[PDB]
């Protein structure tokens, strides 16, 4: 439905060019039709099959048989931490064991992402002069190309920025938590009728209620790699200081949302699941699709309606849904969306946050007329269901500019108000559920099913299994990043080491901006209370006379099998610090360059243990005290 | 209006003819099988299984030696198929229990709402009964799938096994030992063309609740469907047992397909079933023919035709592309009937794409009218008014297979010795439920330090005397493990302390109807629960007193309606840590207090 004249100007007014031309027809079997995006949610084959691949990744990394075998050891270790009454985690409870499994897997992925960001910040600061050169000199090139240049000019250890490259280099602890696999083959619905016998409580303690089962079956975790975050950070940065501020600003928001996601399962209410509505007739002249996204790790949802070639969206609050309607009040409007449309409902799990989903929706709305209907649906469904960035470079650039804007201080959505409000809604819901269950059944039964111990993800006392790949002189080193902290109070860190040898000595060192501590222990199969901290309101800590925001803990042990680090706050429900923004992150600066230094346990001496500063050591050889 | 781009993006794709679409699928099934069952683990555990089987006191000619390669390969195939089938039956029994709890709401749903689709009705029923799985879509079924229900992969089991060991005119003990280590080329070919299919109760509820108006009818339909499925699976294991190479499905396509004159031929050869399907797609016309897999005295693979739907030419010339079906013959016939009725209002691409996707990936078509007709035909083919008399065909398949086993062994016994024939064609591996087999139980429930392993006793497709035993391996040197068998009147608690050795728990007799008398009451199935501290593996063994126990007729809809058995008592548990000596025995529910099934009170 359009032809062009030969020997005419190739320039066009529009900046985003559709693969199918203005005729809106692509001959099948051509290259243009081959590189067209594919609908994943709409196509039953691709949605069915995608779930198979995600299930395989979860099962290969985390095995249900392994988790059930380690339940007894974990229960003993959690009892070894002598916690005040009303604050102990009792893994013999079926419900409490479930939340630990979800919490442990979710925290480990978040913790690993923070570690990768720390090394990335270290590499950027090391090459400040050449990083500032690339940012200032080149501005017309694409954000992806700028990200590739930055990762090349630094020792990023992950040069690829594409989605295929990101999946190629990814640890076992990063793969998202697949909810259905966790809840498989687990007893539901123990009926104990007016029996307070100790045997009756024991069997009831062994099962879970049906509400918890629905929550797990509609749960999927989102963890954003630092390589995907570099594009929004470097799209408008003019200096390395600005770029580092953006990187920390985004991960602070992702930090808050991940904590919020876990609290939804703890509260004791059924979390809604995202769905897509399609017309009943597959071969319909008038085509419309509706997407309702309910991010579990977030506080704001998104409804995207594509009617013909017109795209409209609405952002709604996930709190305050007192009425029968699932959607709360709408915070940002982008047209009129009809959620009463009748059609086939297909359920899906999003692998991108609300910010990333919103960023693409604004970009598509800008290019509503330039792109065809298939391209609009394909790009949107690929990003939502696969976290795959569009091949259209012009569209990709616009998405990342919007991603930066929603994160920066000039965002149309004030996230702190909504994140704070969601926290208040969740705790109020938990209180209402507990008292409602207190009237129906006994107080003992209520504590079984909805525990008051867990609450938030980082408030909860969780364990993080560490993986070690570096061994020096027979001593394998296990890394753990202490901090940052979203809550203030007194916090304790413990380490458990199991190894084949009957007796052994293992060393733990804690790196700050000044120097290490060099603790040495010999106990096995029991937590050791390695180090104890205090956290200010702003999240900073005066560690040995210097304010710190994060520390690096390294554990050295010979012929070890598993090393676990436990964490517990002194008081239950530690109050949360305000989430940092771009201004807060650039206002103060800490040096993490010292975290890569490592010691050799084999050559250690008695005088070396204790708090030592860098001046005491000479250049290199951070193990021997004499300079 | 629309540009038409989105319609082409959601069109079904040919997953058999496309070589890119066949390679990708085969990889995922292989990966899925290896993850759940590892060749290294099974081979390493061979010695432990062999000692367990021998420790069971089996008379001569009725015992199995996994030291033989053929006996070991048959056992792992048998254990994998039985475990998946057994898991489905427990899921079905649980689903029946939830429906019976809420019969009032289920009856209202079945009566008031009839204009909605089969999928919509199933979703409403699952939500009301509060079942563990509440998704009827393909993705939901895949997501909520246990490790044991994964279909077995043929080539993975047959990988890296010695084939074709040649000893010449030697009766020496050492030569016999080396002969037993290898396997015959025929068994390798059979395993390379073997894939199993185990349908989920969620997939069956759509056919069961498409015309039902009462909870009893819905429950009876569910039981009737699963009776057919288990009989078909039993045929599947017997097919590999005899000394015959099984046929495997293929598609014939033109060597140089034309744009406007293209034809497709599908020949489905369900390994679990007595009947096959031939489907031809020429133009917009679909023709099908249902043939009998037994007989085939001639060179042609097809037997006599038992259902006609047109003229299908199986002698067409073209490229041959081979595949394994993930659906039963009933499901394939159900779709091909609906496609034939709706051939006018569907395009060529929809007809091929919908057919190939269902056969290869068990994917139901997205068309709502097509899906409703498919499940209506599925119900008809498994009901008492079916165009196919199944009990005749499954019976005839059994007689044909036993006849082939006798002539294959007798043919070998002439060509080589009796000992050579015995190690190559065992007589102790007749049928899946007839054979002695083991079930590697898994447990995720811990009551006061005791892990619970559940097991379903029955239902029985054979009659005679049966024996059940447990082998418990525990990290502790000394432990006390309990076994509880739950019936309708009450439960029976026993206490044992022996470890790393099979121990018989239950002696049961089952009559012609397939119903046993457990302590003065007729039962069709029982539940066995095992409680162990810090257990590593718990296996349950089953064997029949006589070899090749006679069959029990398959039960249809009216058989299930006539006799009703309560299964609500399978849910309750006991706490062995709080057991007492006086509480250890056979006791009824009126003795116990309400809610505490541990102390007599």
């Amino acid at each position: 439905a359009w032809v062009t004249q030969a020997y005419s100007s190739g320039l066009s007014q529009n900046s985003i060019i559709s693969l199918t031309g203005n005729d809106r027809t692509v001959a099948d079997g051509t290259f243009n039709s081959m590189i067209m995006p594919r609908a994943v949610i709409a196509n039953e084959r691709e949605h069915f099959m995608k779930t198979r691949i995600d299930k395989i990744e979860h099962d290969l990394n985390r095995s249900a048989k392994q988790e059930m075998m380690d339940r007894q050891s974990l229960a003993e270790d959690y009892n070894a931490l002598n916690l005040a009454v009303g604050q102990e985690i009792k893994l013999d409870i079926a419900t409490q064991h479930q939340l630990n499994r979800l919490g442990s897997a979710m925290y480990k992925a978040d913790h690993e992402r923070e570690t990768e960001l720390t090394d990335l910040i270290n590499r950027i600061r090391e090459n400040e002069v050449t990083v500032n050169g690339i940012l200032e000199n080149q501005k017309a090139i694409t954000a992806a190309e700028r990200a590739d240049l930055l990762l090349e000019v630094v020792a990023s250890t992950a040069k690829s920025v594409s989605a295929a490259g990101r999946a190629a280099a990814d640890g076992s602890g990063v793969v998202p938590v697949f909810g259905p696999s966790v809840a498989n083959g687990i007893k539901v619905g123990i009926d104990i009728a007016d029996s307070v016998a100790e045997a009756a409580i024991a069997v009831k303690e062994s099962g879970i209620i049906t509400q918890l089962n629905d929550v797990y079956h509609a749960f999927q975790s989102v963890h954003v790699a630092p390589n995907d975050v570099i594009k929004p950070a470097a799209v408008v940065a003019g200096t390395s200081t600005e770029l580092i501020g953006n990187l920390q600003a985004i991960y602070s928001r992702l930090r808050s949302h991940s904590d919020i996601g876990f609290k939804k399962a703890t509260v004791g209410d059924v979390i809604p699941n995202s769905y897509m509505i399609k017309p009943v007739n597959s071969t319909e002249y008038a085509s419309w699709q509706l997407y309702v996204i309910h991010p579990v790790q977030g506080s704001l949802g998104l409804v995207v309606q594509l009617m013909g070639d017109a795209l409209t969206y609405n952002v709604f609050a996930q709190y305050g849904n007192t009425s029968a309607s699932e959607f709360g009040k709408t915070v940002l409007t982008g047209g009129a969306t009809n959620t009463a449309l009748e059609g086939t409902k297909v359920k899906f799990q999003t692998k991108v946050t609300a910010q990333q989903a919103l960023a693409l929706t604004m970009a598509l709305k800008d290019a509503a007329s330039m792109l065809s209907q298939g391209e609009l649906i394909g790009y949107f469904e690929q990003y939502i269901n696969l976290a795959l960035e569009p091949d259209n470079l012009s569209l990709q650039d616009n998405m990342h500019k919007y991603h930066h804007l929603l994160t920066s201080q000039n965002s149309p959505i004030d996230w702190n108000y909504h994140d704070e409000e969601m926290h208040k809604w969740l705790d109020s819901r938990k209180t209402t559920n507990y008292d409602a269950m207190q009237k129906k059944d006994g107080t003992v039964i209520a504590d079984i099913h909805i525990p008051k111990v867990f609450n938030d993800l980082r408030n909860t006392t969780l364990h993080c299994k560490l993986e070690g790949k570096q061994t020096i002189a027979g001593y394998t080193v296990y890394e753990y990043l202490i901090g940052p902290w979203a809550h203030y109070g007194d916090i304790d860190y413990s380490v458990v080491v199991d190894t084949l040898n009957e007796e052994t000595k293992w060393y733990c060192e804690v790196i700050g901006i000044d120097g290490h501590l060099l603790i040495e222990k010999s106990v096995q199969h029991k937590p050791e209370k390695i180090l104890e901290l205090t956290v200010n309101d702003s999240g900073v800590t005066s560690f040995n006379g210097r304010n710190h925001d994060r520390l690096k803990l390294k554990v050295y042990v010979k012929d070890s099998l598993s090393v676990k680090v436990f964490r517990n706050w002194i008081g239950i429900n530690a109050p949360r610090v305000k989430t940092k923004m771009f201004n807060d992150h650039i206002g103060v600066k800490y040096d993490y360059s010292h975290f890569d230094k490592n010691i050799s346990p084999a050559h250690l001496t008695l005088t070396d243990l204790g708090w030592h500063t860098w001046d005491q050591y000479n250049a290199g050889n951070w193990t021997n005290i004499k300079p | 209006v629309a540009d038409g781009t989105f319609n082409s993006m959601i069109m079904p794709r040919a997953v058999i003819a496309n070589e890119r679409e066949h390679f990708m699928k085969t990889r995922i099934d292989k990966i899925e099988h290896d993850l759940n069952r590892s060749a290294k683990q099974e081979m390493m555990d061979r010695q432990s299984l062999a000692e367990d089987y021998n420790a069971l006191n089996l008379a001569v000619g009725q015992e199995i030696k996994l030291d033989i390669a053929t006996q070991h390969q048959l056992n792992r195939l048998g254990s994998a198929m039985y475990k998946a089938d057994h898991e489905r039956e427990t899921e079905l029994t649980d689903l029946i229990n939830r429906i019976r709890e809420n019969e009032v709401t289920v009856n209202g749903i079945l009566e008031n709402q009839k204009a909605i689709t089969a999928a919509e009705r199933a979703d409403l029923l699952l939500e009301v009964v509060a079942s563990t799985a509440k998704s009827v879509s393909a993705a939901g079924r895949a997501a909520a799938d246990g490790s044991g229900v994964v279909p077995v992969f043929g080539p993975s089991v047959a990988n890296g096994i010695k084939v074709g060991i040649d000893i010449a005119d030697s009766v020496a003990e050492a030569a016999i030992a080396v002969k037993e280590s290898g396997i015959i080329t025929q068994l390798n070919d059979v395993y390379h063309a073997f894939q199993s299919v185990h349908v989920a109760p969620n997939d069956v509820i759509k056919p069961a609740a498409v015309v039902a108006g009462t909870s009893t009818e819905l429950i009876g339909n569910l039981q009737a469907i699963y009776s057919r499925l288990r009989s078909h699976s039993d045929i599947g294991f017997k097919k590999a047992t005899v000394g015959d190479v099984i046929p495997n499905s293929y598609m014939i396509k033109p060597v140089n397909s034309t744009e406007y004159a293209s034809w497709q031929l599908y020949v489905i050869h369900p390994v679990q079933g007595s009947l096959g399907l031939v489907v031809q797609l020429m133009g917009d016309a679909l023709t099908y023919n249902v043939f009998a897999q037994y007989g085939n005295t001639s060179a042609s693979e097809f037997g006599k035709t038992v259902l006609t739907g047109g003229a299908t030419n199986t002698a067409l010339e073209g490229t041959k592309v081979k595949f394994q079906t993930k659906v039963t013959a009933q499901q394939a016939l159900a779709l091909t009937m609906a496609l034939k009725d709706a051939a006018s209002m569907l395009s060529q691409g929809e007809l091929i794409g919908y057919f190939e996707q269902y056969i290869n990936l068990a994917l139901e078509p997205d068309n709502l009218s097509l899906q409703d007709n498919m499940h209506k035909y599925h119900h008809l083919l498994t009901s008492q008014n079916s165009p196919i008399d199944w009990n005749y065909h499954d019976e005839e398949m059994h007689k044909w297979l036993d006849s082939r086993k006798t002539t294959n062994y007798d043919a070998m016994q002439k060509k080589d010795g009796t000992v050579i024939a015995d190690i190559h064609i065992p007589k102790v591996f007749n049928d899946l439920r007839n054979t002695t087999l083991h079930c590697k139980l898994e447990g995720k429930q811990t009551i006061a330090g005791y892990t619970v392993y559940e097991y379903l006793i029955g239902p029985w497709a054979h009659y005679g005397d049966i024996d059940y035993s447990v082998v418990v391996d525990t990290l502790n040197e000394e432990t006390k493990w309990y076994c509880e068998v739950i019936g309708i009147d009450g439960h029976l608690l026993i206490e044992k302390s022996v470890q790393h050795k099979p121990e018989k728990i239950l002696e049961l007799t089952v009559n012609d109807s397939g119903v046993t008398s457990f302590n003065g009451r007729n039962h069709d199935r029982l539940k066995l629960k095992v409680y162990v501290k810090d257990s590593l593996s718990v296996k349950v063994f089953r064997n029949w007193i006589g070899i090749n126990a006679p069959r029990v007729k398959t039960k249809m809809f009216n058989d299930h309606i006539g006799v009703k058995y309560d299964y609500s008592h399978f849910d309750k548990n006991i706490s062995p840590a709080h057991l007492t000596l006086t509480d250890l025995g056979w006791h009824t529910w009126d003795q116990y207090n309400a809610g505490n099934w541990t102390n007599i009170k």
């Binding site: 075998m69 050891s73 199991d498 199969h525 099998l561 | 990290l475 810090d534 590593l536």
Partner: peptide, 15 residues
């Protein structure tokens, strides 16, 4: 090799 299996194996060998 699991943590529980290692702990019990060591306990069995020592005691």
């Amino acid at each position: 090799l699991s943590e529980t299996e290692l702990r019990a194996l060591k306990k069995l060998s020592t005691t």
